[PDB]
């Protein structure tokens, strides 16, 4: 048995979600989920370090930020998630949200992920489609945020001695730094 | 045996490279290799459509863009690649680089990939480190070009009807356009 399932009280699945987010952090080698408020990011295989710096963030989002949390479950197991934020965005304090998106027709989608062992199974499409329609039925337009510095090559090169020097056109040029490389 | 091999005549392993690159195309669901000029990218599992659009580029690059091509092999099997461009870069038709950065001190690293089956085994590091060293020796400062739009989330969302509306240094906001979807 499987399917989309709404979580009545998002905070009650924090532990299960925490572990799902860690497996993703490890599978993506520290790429996701994003840790904007973290100076030094923990090793992707370090769960304790991950939890210590992510648990507080999740606790807050599950309690206040998220207005609706949806998950894809298979036999009572969360293998996919997606959250909606639409209740008074102007007062949500969402760090990336500009004044232009602080209006009644704005709907935010976030916390969208899929268990790394269930990719290309149609789960992401089902979740996203459900989320887009849910927001629409609420008279809201769907918006999302993304972090380009997480692009695969840039991310790899960056932690390999390269530094950003230019980003003209649809490209981002990086340059190797000898002193930065050895700094590892 | 295994290790890094310098391909004397890059155009000789064109077919094997095509095969490897298609495996990457399929493994990254159409993300890599980048097909910028392509308005309508072929389905990630469509080898014929992939070749028709990518093979001509690869062919040109192997013969006219790359000055040096290195691979990492396990016997005759290519499982990693990396190329160097540092000779007369102002005359290779390169469009993904600024005119201000096309001097004799510039060295370009491209065609860097590793077979999806050999991740986290040190292959990538070995090749990159080799490339960087070789470039520095020739008195060239190594540079690479990346495509931010290929970021996992962006790429996925853009494929699902999302379009960019606002851009910031650390993030980019995307809005769903039903009328377009």
Show the domains of chain B with their CATH numbers: 2-145 (3.40.630.30), 146-181 (6.20.300.10)
CB contact under 8 A, A171 and B125: no
Tell me which residues of chain B, numbers 73 to 92, contact chain A at a CB-CB cutoff of 8 Å: none
Does B33 sit behind a cis peptide bond, omega within 30 degrees of 0 on the bond before it? yes
- Name the residue among B146, B151, B154 with its Cβ closest to that of A171: B146
**Method used for this model?**
X-ray
Residue of chain A nearest B33, judged by CA positions: A153
- Those residues whose C-beta lies under 8 Å from the C-beta of residue A17, and which sit 6 or more positions away, are A58, A62, A78, A81
Determine contact, residues A175/A165, Cβ cutoff 8 Å: yes
Task: Classify each residue of B33-56 as buried b or exposed e, where b means 16 or more C-beta atoms within 10 Å of its C-beta.
Answer: bbbbeeeebbebeebeebbeebbe
Question: What residues does B78 pair with on adjacent strands?
Answer: B73
Resolution in A: 2.1
Residue A60 burial (CB < 10 Å; 0-12/13-18/19+)? exposed
Q: Are A8 and A67 in contact (CB under 8 A)?
A: no
Supply the Cα-derived Rg of chain A in whole angstroms: 18
Q: What distance in Å separates residue A133's CA from the closest CA in chain B? A: 10
Please identify which residue in the block is written with the tokens 């050895």: A182
B148–A145: do the CB atoms touch at under 8 Å?
A: no
Is the Cβ pair B157, A144 closer than 8 Å?
Answer: yes
Give bridge partners of residue A142 from the DSSP assignment. A107
Strand order, beta sheet including A68-74: A2-6, A68-74, A78-85, A106-114, A141-146, B172-176, B162-167
Report the residue from B143, B162, B171 with minimal CB separation from A175: B143
What does DSSP assign to residue A12? G
Q: Is B126 within 8 Å of B105 (Cβ atoms)? A: no
Kindly give, in sequence order, each residue whose CB lies less than 8 Å from that of residue B73, ignoring residues fewer than 6 positions away.
B2, B3, B5, B79, B80
Strands B106-114 and B141-146: parallel
- Listed by number, the residues of chain A in 96-125 with a beta carbon closer than 8 Å to a beta carbon of chain B are 96, 98, 100-101, 112, 120, 124-125
End-to-end CA gap in chain A: 48
Kindly tell me the burial class for residue B14, based on how many C-beta atoms sit within 10 Å of its own C-beta (0-12, 13-18, 19 or more). Answer: middle
Angle in degrees, 0-180, between the axes of helices A47-60 and A14-27, rounded to the nearest 10 = 130
Instruction: Say whether B144 and A153 touch across the interface (CB within 8 A).
Output: yes
Across the interface, of B97, B153, B178, the residue whose CB is closest to A146 is: B153
Could you tell me how many helices (H) and strands (E) chain B has, helices first? 4, 7
3-class state of residue B159 by DSSP = helix
State the nearest Cα–Cα gap between A31 and chain B, in angstroms.
10
Tell me, yes or no, if A159 comes closer than 8 A to chain B by beta carbon: no
């Amino acid at each position: 048995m499987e399917g989309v399932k709404k979580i009545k009280n998002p905070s009650t699945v924090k532990d299960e979600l925490l572990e799902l987010m860690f497996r993703i952090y490890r599978s993506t080698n520290g790429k996701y989920p994003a840790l904007e408020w973290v100076k030094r990011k923990p090793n992707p295989n370090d769960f304790n370090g991950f939890r210590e710096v992510y648990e507080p963030f999740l606790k807050f989002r599950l309690s206040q930020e998220f207005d609706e949390l949806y998950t894809y479950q298979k036999d009572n197991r969360i293998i996919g998630t997606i959250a909606l934020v639409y209740k008074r965005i102007k007062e949500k304090g969402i760090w990336w949200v500009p004044e232009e998106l602080m209006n009644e027709k704005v709907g935010l989608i976030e916390f969208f992920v899929v268990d790394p062992e269930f990719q290309g199974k149609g789960i992401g499409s089902t979740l996203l489609e459900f989320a887009v329609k849910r927001l629409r039925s609420l008279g809201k337009d769907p918006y999302v945020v993304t972090f380009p510095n997480l692009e695969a090559y840039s991310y790899y090169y960056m932690k390999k001695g390269f530094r950003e020097i230019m980003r003209y056109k649809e490209f981002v040029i990086l340059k190797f730094n000898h002193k930065k490389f050895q700094l590892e």
